[PDB]
Symmetry: D3
């Protein structure tokens, strides 16, 4: 059996982009993930509109509403929530997404790159996650038998 995820991961900084690629690749290799039917936000831009070359839409309340609703709906309609957390950039963005997944009854799984695993994560991130793994365990993670654990590191 397989499972679909919401790809909670930012694409705005060097280290976010590096973590993104690594997590994408992690999931292609994992036989318990159905990546084709997962929700990856960048593949699901509203009406194909690219905010980077069309930033006028950042002032458009309809676009904002559509995008927001689509991401939520992406969390709500998939099995597992995936949070690529960058401890140094204090995991900024996915807080709300992680919180919404918890409210919808999803397994919330934080993945941290190995270079950063062990660094201090926020109390709320530690508390909201059902498990926190290294990037390199993500490929061999069994999403059919997801269990609870604590992060082995500091919590600020």
């Amino acid at each position: 059996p397989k499972k679909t995820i919401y790809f909670g991961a930012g694409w705005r900084t060097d280290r976010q982009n590096k973590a993104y690629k690594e997590a994408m690749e992690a999931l292609k290799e994992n036989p318990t993930i159905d990546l084709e039917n997962s929700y990856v936000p960048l593949d699901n831009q509203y009406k194909g509109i690219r905010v980077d070359e069309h930033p006028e839409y950042l002032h458009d309340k309809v676009w904002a509403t559509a995008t927001y609703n689509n991401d939520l709906n992406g969390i709500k309609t998939n099995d597992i929530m995936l949070g690529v957390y960058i401890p140094d950039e204090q995991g900024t963005g996915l807080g709300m997404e992680l919180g919404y997944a918890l409210s919808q009854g999803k397994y919330v799984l934080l993945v941290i790159p190995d270079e950063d695993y062990g660094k201090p994560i926020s109390l709320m991130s530690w508390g909201v996650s059902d498990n926190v793994i290294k990037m390199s365990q993500l490929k061999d993670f069994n999403f059919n038998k997801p269990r609870f654990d604590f992060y082995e590191g500091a919590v600020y």
Copy 2:
């Protein structure tokens, strides 16, 4: 005629501390807020012990379990959720998300000198309303309503 709040605000950066003081002072002046009976996270850290003062507790799971639970309980047992949002720079998203799931009015307060700046799409969407810090003292928390942030999203 008096609502209680959860004081969702950080205390690490200079900006954070300055917004923290302004908002707390605002809440004291608001006759529709009952601050004595509100939850302020700094005063409710497990065993009355602040991580920043005793970093010992960075690696203590009883402390982190207890403090996390105390903060959730502070959101759920109070009427309104307040988020002091500094757009240029938290842990706030999960607090905001938890409030939303618990049926609370979610109010973001942004310092006057930052109001207008782009806030994150999820912050924008999870909030019921978004105000300036100089408005917090007069906000009627007995008639809380939806409104859109006067600013863009990123």
Copy 3:
């Protein structure tokens, strides 16, 4: 000793308007209802603009987004959900359903001249209690309880 409500009632048909006036007048007389601080949808339409008065806004998504959110926020931030139910004839089911999910007491009020008539199975099942309009002025909203509608279902 004072609860606030969400005033779930339509204002299109003659019957709807008549039940609307009767119920509002009842709520004014009820000393356990705090009507000043209750949410009445007609007074909280986005930009203070009523669709029926300015149908322009039928095709405005900002307006519909904002007004929908305002009504949800009116249900979730108030104590009780009130549904003025006209059995012979809304949008009320979703309001009722949202209240149920938010943990609110769901009270249906049916005009005396219609009380006894069949209500829909889902209306029947989602409601915590079902009363006559002439009872609304004296209902104790501080001790709200479950009871079955004295009537059939369809």
Copy 4:
């Protein structure tokens, strides 16, 4: 992969019945719906009791409780919520069902017959739905990748 739905659709008026048949047929043809394991209310009458030739049961609080609980349980235990909405008959009945599906974290999908698509829907229906499609798009709808959109028409 396939998905199960709750068949939110009334059977009481001419145009409801016509929309019912069209939606049933839509789903048999859609390869992403598992219609055998979906919940269709009329197939799930309590103890096989036909209210039309046995209306005495409309005064029976036990029957009412059973039926109500079964429909909810039908929404709760399937993947997607399906609402056949008749704009002219102001979609009366499914409001509560749509609201309950939203509370259980389901994709809520309104289908309107093409003859009526574009006519004014209620604010709450517009707001509660994750998408609103024409009857003829229902057969080719991909329930494995359900996304958000707005209704292209009036909202009253």
Copy 5:
């Protein structure tokens, strides 16, 4: 400054009855509890009829449907959920679980002579706080907080 509760306590065993009386008397003395407007299950049995007094109703589904719904409505429309827990010996777990899902502060009260004894893991985990019976009269229900039971789990 006054919160209402749901009085989650059994009345079958001797111990249950003794804890029932102690807790009710405690709640009367607590100036932060509004007991008149609280839900006490024994006083809200369907048709004012107690199963133990009229076991006739053991086999009545209208009665069981109505009483179950009334108890859920008593949890959801009140501020705090109270569980009188007798560790040596309910139906209480589902009441506790329902409160948790409804966003209520969950307080367990254990008789002084039993406090220290092992409570079930799920009781331990679902509760926001766990106190002695002799503390109930002075508990500040306006500032309810998380704390760990001073005792083991089984």
Copy 6:
């Protein structure tokens, strides 16, 4: 299609143990249960720690937190909630679990051993369950089409 359950069942008394075995066996034989990917608590002890030969951990708040969170997470991440209810031992333990499953939108199914079926169950158990069956119907129970019914017996 198959479904995963949470095995809500105690292992502390003679009659609980007998009911446990019977329910385990019931599920191996049921083709609509995927028992390999279900959550059975005893197979999911935190860090393999056996409380019976290591009861020091009963005073360990971290172990308690881990275990509790794992069981919840077991309910939340499976399809159906299964409650092996012993009417005589007044079904003590699963109340919270049953309540949590109801809050997460799960079908809650009580199974009672045939010897005890008909005996008085608690109001809350009766009210929280979507159905109550005999142990011997559990093998032939179709979890792909779970429906509502009342318990045929006393409710105290």
